Amino acid sequence: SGTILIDLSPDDKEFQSVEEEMQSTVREHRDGGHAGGIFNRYNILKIQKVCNKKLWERYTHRRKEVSEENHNHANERMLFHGSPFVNAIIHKGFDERHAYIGGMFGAGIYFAENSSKSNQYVYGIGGGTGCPVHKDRSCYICHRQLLFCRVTLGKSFLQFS
Amino acid sequence: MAHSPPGHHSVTGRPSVNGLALAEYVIYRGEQAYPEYLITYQIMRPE
Ligand SMILES: CC(C)(C)c1ccc(-c2nc3c(N(O)O)cccc3c(=O)[nH]2)cc1
């Protein structure tokens, strides 16, 4: 597919700034942990950079279109994405299949500033049945995977809750 | 896949009732997001 995963050492400054954003954005959720589990912090086992020229040039191209339609401001953020299809996302890229059709804000790809929120979707909608091994949505054993993505928002419609 | 609101490129969900909650965002073009970092982790049991 053209994707290579480069491991980062915990002494690398990128590793540390990403882990900080991962840990500092945890919060308690109104379900008490039903979907993502009960936890105040993570144990980071590994952080890897994703490298794919086709998928990057695909992103930078759209970013330019959005920027030129919004006074040269792409409104770019770094956001979390949890999904059962992370393996397909890092190789084939985002597309319709990775959309939440039942989402509160429409049928699209959802991202979060709270890592703990994206964690609720690692095993599917509302945690699904939990980890594939123990069927435990609050498993402290099995390994999980999140994505820390570069997102272009352009002009964003504000929907108050 | 749905469309973005006319004249917009994404949707920002502002947390209202919940005070500690941060924003959530929605895009309708897979090309407006690049997966930069793949993080492998475990949730930790509170003391
Ligand atoms: C249907 C499918 C493909 C299995 C699916 C994948 C990913 C998500 C998902 N939703 C989120 C969300 N929503 O939607 O409230 C808010 C904040 C973050 C996220 C997130 O990181 N991922 C939802 C469905």
Ligand SMILES: [Zn+2]
């Ligand atoms: Zn498990």
